[PDB]
Amino acid sequence: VPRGSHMLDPSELPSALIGKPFPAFDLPSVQDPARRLTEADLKGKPALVNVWGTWCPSCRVEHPELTRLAEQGVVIYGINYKDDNAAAIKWLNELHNPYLLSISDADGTLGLDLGVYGAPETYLIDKQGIIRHKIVGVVDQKVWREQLAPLYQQLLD
């Protein structure tokens, strides 16, 4: 089955939101639909924002690395993207939860503003919630070391 050229829209490029504030949102937490989170909750420390879903085999694979980073003091926030809430809860309970906040993006409206088109994807934000880098696909030790860590270290200092 032949397939012609399909071009990602500009908002989906890693470079799209560099130097821009994290998009505004008002969304329920994963574990409690009565607890609301906004982009204000993302501010304070340089951090990773990781987009994931239980539908995503690559997120299963990426999980140990996120845990490894959190153990080293790295703040990581999770956006649970277009997922089954019950399944997401199980995932956060049965696996070693690396996330300081878990945002339920069930309709993908936050992902839409971010240019999300799959998972995992990871954003580096500074203390003010400004986006400084985006990784498309699994972050492993080499991706961390070469593509995030030097930026992250600069944001700490």
Curated annotation (Swiss-Prot):
Record-annotated disulphide pairs: 56-59
One Gene Ontology cellular component annotation held by this UniProt entry: plasma membrane
Ranges in the topological domain labelled Periplasmic: 8-157
Main location: membrane
Residue ranges of domain Thioredoxin in the record: 16-157
Any single GO BP term: cytochrome complex assembly
Topology within the bilayer: Single-pass membrane protein
Protein location: Cell inner membrane
GO molecular function: disulfide oxidoreductase activity
Key words, A-Z: Cell inner membrane, Cell membrane, Cytochrome c-type biogenesis, Disulfide bond, Membrane, Redox-active center, Transmembrane, Transmembrane helix
Family as reported in the entry's similarity comment: Belongs to the thioredoxin family. DsbE subfamily.
Summary of the function given for this chain in its UniProt record: Involved in disulfide bond formation. Catalyzes a late, reductive step in the assembly of periplasmic c-type cytochromes, probably the reduction of disulfide bonds of the apocytochrome c to allow covalent linkage with the heme. Possible subunit of a heme lyase.
Protein name: Thiol:disulfide interchange protein DsbE
Organism of derivation: Pseudomonas aeruginosa (strain ATCC 15692 / DSM 22644 / CIP 104116 / JCM 14847 / LMG 12228 / 1C / PRS 101 / PAO1)
